[PDB]
Design a protein around this ligand. Sequence first.
Ligand SMILES: Nc1ncnc2c1ncn2[C@@H]1O[C@H](CSCC[C@H](N)C(=O)O)[C@@H](O)[C@H]1O
Lengths: 244, 8
Amino acid sequence: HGVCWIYYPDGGSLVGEVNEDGEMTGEKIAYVYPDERTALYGKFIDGEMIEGKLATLMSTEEGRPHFELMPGNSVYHFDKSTSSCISTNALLPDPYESERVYVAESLISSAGEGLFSKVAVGPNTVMSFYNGVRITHQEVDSRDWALNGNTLSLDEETVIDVPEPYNHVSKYCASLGHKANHSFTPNCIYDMFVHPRFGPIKCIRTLRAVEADEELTVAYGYDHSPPEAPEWYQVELKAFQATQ
Amino acid sequence: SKSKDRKY
Ligand SMILES: Nc1ncnc2c1ncn2[C@@H]1O[C@H](CSCC[C@H](N)C(=O)O)[C@@H](O)[C@H]1O
C-alpha cells in the first residue's frame, strides 16, 4: 500500500504505487524531472510512459507525491527515435527544457545560433536534452564532416544526429541540445540522461552557476590525436593551446 | 570518430 520512488543517476525518477511484481504500472504513475517539481503524470506500463500529463509536484505527504495538473491538455508518450524518425511530435517542446533555455544568435563569431539560459541556475543543473535519430558510427565516420555538425556519440554502438532540416527550430524543437556551441572553456557538459519521451539520450548539464541570458557552451570532445575535427574546431584548438 | 563526446 506504499509508494516507491526509483531514481535514475541523472536525478529524474519514477514514482507511484508499484504492482505485485514491483513494476511502475498504473493510471497514477509519474516521471519527475530533476528539478523535483516538473512531472509527467498518468498511465505507465512497467515504467514506460503511455500518457503522461504535465503536472507540478506541489508537496509530498508520507512520501506520496501530491500533483497539480497544468492547464492545456499537454500530454506526452514514450517515443524513442529510430534511424529515420526523430519524433512523432517534432514541434511539441519538452516542458522542462522550455522553462530553462532558448535559442538566439550565438555570441561566438560566425557560429550561427546558440543556446542560452532563460533564468539563473546553480551548478549541476540539467538544462537541455540532446535527442536525435540513432545511426551507426560506421555511417557517421564514413561520410563527410559537412554532414556531421550535429552528431553526438551516445555509446559504442550509437550516434545521435539532428540532420537537416531538423537543425532548424521551425522544423524541430522537441529538444534543443544540438543548439549549444562548442567551447574549450565550457560552462556545461554533455551527460547521460534517461528521458521518459526520448529514452536513453544525453543532456546538457551546468558545471557551475549560470546567469539569466548567459550562453551555454559545451566541449565537443573530438579526438585531438587519433585532430579528426572540422576546420573551425582545429583553428580554435590551436588558439586554446596558445592561451595555455 | 566524426561525432561529439566519444570515450576514447
Ligand atoms: N566554437 C565554435 N566556433 C565556430 N562555430 C561553432 C562553434 N561551436 C559550434 N559551431 C558551429 O555550430 C555547428 C554545430 S551545432 C551548434 C548550433 C549551430 N550553431 C546552429 O546554429 O544550429 C558547427 O557545425 C559550427 O557551424
